């Protein structure tokens, strides 16, 4: 996925070119500038769109692999990250409504925090396999609790502010031009009325509403299909 699958995040890519893309074109500056090892980058805030397409778009423009963690069962991934010199690690399946009590996010995310603590302590140990990066952003401050388990290190702090629907309308057109879509779709209530704990549920209403566009013989996507899919995901959420 290239930059054509994202829109409205010029500040995040402009700021991420030096956090990530700086040692790509000219790695030689890592001895004259004395910059610290770029131990990944984290984000915080409800991810509307761009949670995975950021590591996949920057990893795509880096021409590197995209490995996913998903005995200890984490050493072999570092062995593959050793044979393959570049690697980008990102996690999913956690961007749900469960990331609101901080108990399952703090424990289940704390295990991955220990995993990246021993892996980044192997990067701090030796640099045989450079350009290893991790990105953590689930929904909210819980990532700042991951920063509570990883304080004052080289990790970078980047916030995702949606000014007004500019990360939902144009990206709904980009993520929706595959199938048919209506022009005057009102995303104000049906897109602002699901903030906070669940940001991926917008795309969940997109795909799960497309299921009702298939079974309901609807050629295009309407407003009552998203309105019904919001309730259908809110019975389980």
């Amino acid at each position: 996925s290239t930059y054509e699958m994202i829109g409205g995040l010029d500040k995040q890519i402009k700021e991420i070119k030096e956090v990530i893309e700086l040692p790509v074109k000219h790695p030689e500056l890592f001895e004259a500038l004395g910059i610290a090892q770029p131990k990944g980058v984290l984000l915080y805030g409800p991810p509307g769109t761009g949670k995975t397409l950021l590591a996949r778009a920057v990893a795509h423009h880096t021409d590197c692999t995209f490995i996913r963690v998903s005995a200890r069962m984490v050493r072999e991934l570092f062995v593959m990250a050793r044979e393959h010199a570049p690697s980008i690690i990102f996690m999913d399946e956690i961007d749900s409504i469960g990331s609101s009590r901080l108990e399952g996010g703090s424990g289940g995310d704390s295990e991955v925090q220990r995993t990246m603590l021993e892996l980044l302590n192997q990067l701090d140990g030796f640099e045989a396999t450079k350009n290893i990066k991790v990105i953590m952003a689930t929904n909210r401050i819980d990532i700042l609790d991951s920063a509570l388990l990883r304080p004052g290190r080289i990790d970078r702090k980047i916030e995702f502010p949606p000014p007004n629907e500019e990360a939902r309308l144009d990206i709904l057109k980009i993520h929706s031009r595959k199938m048919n879509l209506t022009r005057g779709i009102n995303l104000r209530k049906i897109a602002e009325l699901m903030p906070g704990a669940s940001g991926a549920e917008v795309k969940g209403v997109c795909t799960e509403a497309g299921m009702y566009a298939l079974r309901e013989r609807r050629v295009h996507v309407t407003q009552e299909d998203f309105e019904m899919a919001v309730a259908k995901v809110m019975q389980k959420d």
């Binding site: 998903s70 595959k178 199938m179 048919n180 795909t207 497309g210 299921m211 566009a213 298939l214 079974r215």
Partner: protein, 207 residues
């Protein structure tokens, strides 16, 4: 009311419509995952779908991987995939892969009872986009699962279904349909043309 709907769509909605999945906007999935430890299943739906729609049905046996050390699985089911997509439109059922787990025109239904040893490499989305949870048949599924078997067998007005919907809900057991097949094996005794409660209770206490 969503299991037979998802199996309906992703299994038996494109009747001979090979191009439908080739020109629908939303990418059609191929794998449908079923679960639920209490409800056994894995036979009533394979035979039910295997008898409702007029098509080919070639199921696979779970244990043929000893020779290849859990590697023969994907080769066998992949051969069934290629012969099913090259042959007439068929449906393929996958059963008991927990031991080995340690624009498409194929139909992949998957039912099991263990999700702990499943490697997340297969459960990755794209292929297994739907994970249906099938619990033990409740009172509604017992009225339907008993009506669908007594509709062809013998019955009388004396035989009430309120104790046959109340008691099987109390005894949380598996393969109740096969227990009704045993009730038919005791109803073919020819001693009575119409089956009575003595054969149902006798089959409930003996087998």
């Amino acid at each position: 009311d969503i299991q037979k709907q998802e199996v309906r769509e992703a299994v038996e909605l494109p009747l001979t419509h090979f191009e439908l999945y080739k020109q629908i906007g939303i990418d059609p999935p191929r794998g449908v995952l079923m679960y639920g430890p209490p409800g056994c299943g894995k036979t009533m739906l394979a035979k039910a779908v295997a008898h409702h729609t007029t098509a080919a049905f070639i199921r696979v046996v779970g244990s043929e991987f000893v020779q290849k050390y859990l590697g023969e699985g994907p080769r066998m089911v992949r051969d069934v995939f290629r012969l099913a997509k090259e042959n007439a439109p068929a449906i393929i059922f996958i059963d008991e892969i927990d031991a080995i787990a340690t624009n498409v025109n194929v139909k992949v239904i998957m039912a099991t009872n263990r999700a702990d040893t499943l490697d997340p490499a297969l459960l990755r989305p794209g292929r297994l986009d739907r994970k249906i949870e099938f619990p033990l048949p409740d009172r509604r599924q017992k009225r339907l699962i008993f009506s669908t078997i007594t509709s062809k067998m013998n019955l009388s007005e004396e035989v009430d279904l309120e104790d046959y919907v109340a008691r099987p809900d109390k005894i949380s057991g598996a393969d109740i349909n096969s227990i009704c097949q045993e009730s038919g094996m005791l109803a073919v005794r020819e001693n009575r043309y119409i089956v009575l409660a003595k054969d149902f209770e006798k089959a409930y206490k003996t087998v």
